[PDB]
Each structure stands twice: as structure tokens, then as C-alpha cells.
Design a protein around this ligand. Structure first.
Ligand SMILES: [Zn+2]
Length: 147
């Protein structure tokens, strides 16, 4: 099994988008060969709230697109900023909800223990990200964040 506890503090997220994001992350969990039951939470917030969360939890007084908090396997929490995701979606040329899904996938891989702070880690983690997105059908280069 795989359950996402979703929350949307903005009222912007459509019900169809929750399903699209959950289906992508469930596919990723299977591609990662995680057989156990897993659970996680995804919360959508506006730019004022993401800055406050970034300030108090990361000592970064600034807006950002996604924050992941790593801890049935309980994987932790992903927080996504709708304001930033909408602008990044415009810059990459896919929809708001596609960008929400990409940021959720990125956070999910972080919760599994991947990181990209070194070149070797980045190659491993973006290699998995690209492979999952391609296997799901998201093969256009900018759906990978050109990455
Ligand atoms: Zn990251």
C-alpha cells in the first residue's frame, strides 16, 4: 500500500491533481522496488507560509519551491509552495499541476535518502529521477527540469 496525506492551505489544488500526484509517486515507489507499505504527507502552501516555514525550520528567511523533512514505513513530509510552482511551471513550459508533481517526486526521492549536494550523489539521484519520469511517459527534456 501507499498513502499520501494531502493538505492544501491555498485552495488552488484541484481534486484531479491530487490523483495525478499520488499516481506518479506510487509509480516511483514501485520503480524503487519498495515492497513495504509506505506513507507520507504533501502540503501545499503560499509564498508567505513557505517563507515562515523555511525561516523557523531551516533558518532560511526566504521563499522556496519545495522543502522535504525526512524521518508502514513513515517517510516524512514534503511542503510545496504554490506561488513558486506556478512561476516555475511557466518558465519550464508545462502546467502548474505538472510542476507540483515534479516537485513532489523530487521531495519523495529526498525522503528515500537520495541527495544531490555532491556531483556523485546528484548523478545517482537525477539518474533515478530521469529514469522514473521517462518510464512514466514524461520524456520531454524540460519535464526533467533540463536535468
Ligand atoms: Zn533537492
Amino acid at each position: 500500500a501507499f498513502t499520501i496525506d494531502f493538505s492544501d492551505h491555498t485552495g488552488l489544488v484541484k481534486d484531479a491533481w491530487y490523483k495525478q500526484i499520488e499516481d506518479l509517486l506510487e509509480f516511483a515507489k514501485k520503480e524503487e522496488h519498495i515492497e513495504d507499505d509506505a506513507e507520507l504527507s504533501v502540503t501545499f502552501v503560499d509564498k508567505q507560509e513557505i517563507q515562515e516555514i523555511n525561516r523557523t525550520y531551516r533558518d532560511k528567511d526566504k521563499v522556496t519551491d519545495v522543502i522535504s523533512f525526512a524521518l508502514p514505513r513513515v517517510l516524512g513530509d514534503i511542503i510545496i509552495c504554490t506561488d513558486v510552482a506556478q512561476e516555475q511551471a511557466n518558465n519550464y513550459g508545462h502546467s502548474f499541476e505538472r510542476e507540483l508533481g515534479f516537485l513532489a517526486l523530487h521531495g519523495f526521492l529526498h525522503l528515500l535518502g537520495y541527495d544531490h549536494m555532491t556531483e556523485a550523489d546528484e548523478k545517482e539521484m537525477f539518474g533515478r529521477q530521469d529514469t522514473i519520469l521517462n518510464a512514466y511517459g514524461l520524456t520531454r527534456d524540460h519535464h526533467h527540469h533540463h536535468h
